Structure of Tyrosyl-DNA phosphodiesterase 1:
Amino acid sequence: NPFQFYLTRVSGVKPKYNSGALHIKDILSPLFGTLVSSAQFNYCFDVDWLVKQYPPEFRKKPILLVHGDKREAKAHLHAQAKPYENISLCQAKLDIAFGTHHTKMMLLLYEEGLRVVIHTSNLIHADWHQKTQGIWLSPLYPRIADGTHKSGESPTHFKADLISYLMAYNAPSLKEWIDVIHKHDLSETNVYLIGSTPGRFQGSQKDNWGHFRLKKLLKDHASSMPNAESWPVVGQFSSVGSLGADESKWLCSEFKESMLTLGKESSSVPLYLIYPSVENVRTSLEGYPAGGSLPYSIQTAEKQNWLHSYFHKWSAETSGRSNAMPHIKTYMRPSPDFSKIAWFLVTSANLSKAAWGALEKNGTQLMIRSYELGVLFLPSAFGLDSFKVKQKFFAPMATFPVPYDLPPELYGSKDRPWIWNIPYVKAPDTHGNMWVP
Ligand SMILES: O=C(O)c1cnc2ccccc2c1O
């Protein structure tokens, strides 16, 4: 297949639903390359667990942990890594209030070349055990011969765009990784990078990040079709930020507007949001503890009950993962009958202004609080007008593997969105327990 989009292995489904999946031990295996060093960008780390996922022969190679922790959290992470002399840390600057470093990425430097992995899992046991998570695997990028002058650039501009993302950190340990990338040929890359970095962007920088970056790519590299207003937008996420008192404040004004862009020309488009219900979480493989990774607070939720009429249940029979709660985040544009899609995005970005950006200063400035990263699949980058949706995720190799069921199913009248900081004591979970925060 040309897409190299994978799900993580799930303990407890039948072998047929893990055949095409990847565990972290598979990604770091010597079959993927002879490791010289690596960088792990993430949010949450269990360093003891992480080192055990590298092959024994590679466990002393240098590792850089890129994180956003401060003060006592930062002290804790340093204490976790100190036992391992080969581990260095890079604290991503977070100069805007309430920002987070959410990007999940591996840079893997080999004897044989370089690989980039952009994914959705934290580096802790539970994120790779029974959740639905997404992975994009780059090709093996060869080194450019010393003395040769070539760009090593792809038609999607991936090499320059990844360097730009890393340069935004202004960090010495990542300048070294920038120099590594400069030395490699990334021309085979067929995805576009979509990142978020913290800051306030105007003018020439407005289109660099967040939902304006998505808008720009859709304007430049996708085509509008007749009856485009009938092609829905689907967003699928594991948490929700404060979006405002009604849909006109951000969700349907600037976010949806970016997401419905197609082509260069100048809304009734249906918007489906997929987010686990309480019943989804209760009957999941993990039980209520899955809700520890779906951090929608009651304080936020009670100010935006209007939003929940957009919510659709998690259902993933296509990949055997209806009971594996989602920590993947995806956004896509299906056709009215859900048989095709105009594009697909897998990312760390949840449904929040912090991640995607919010316009300020009379519409002239895009303010982002967080680091996020994802990759965008556009048919034009594969010589196509659209992607056909693969009917079974693990079953004409140009069909795109959507990991959950279409069409999405609306919440029933008795369903409620999972809200993590209130109790659920009406019915027990798959392990026999209630939820008492
Ligand atoms: O992976 C992330 O981006 C993330 C960030 N904050 C989180 C906060 C609470 C529970 C899970 C979280 C999470 O899974």
Remarks:
- The pocket of 4-hydroxyquinoline-3-carboxylic acid is lined by residues 43, 102, 122, 293, 295, 348 (CB under 6 Å).
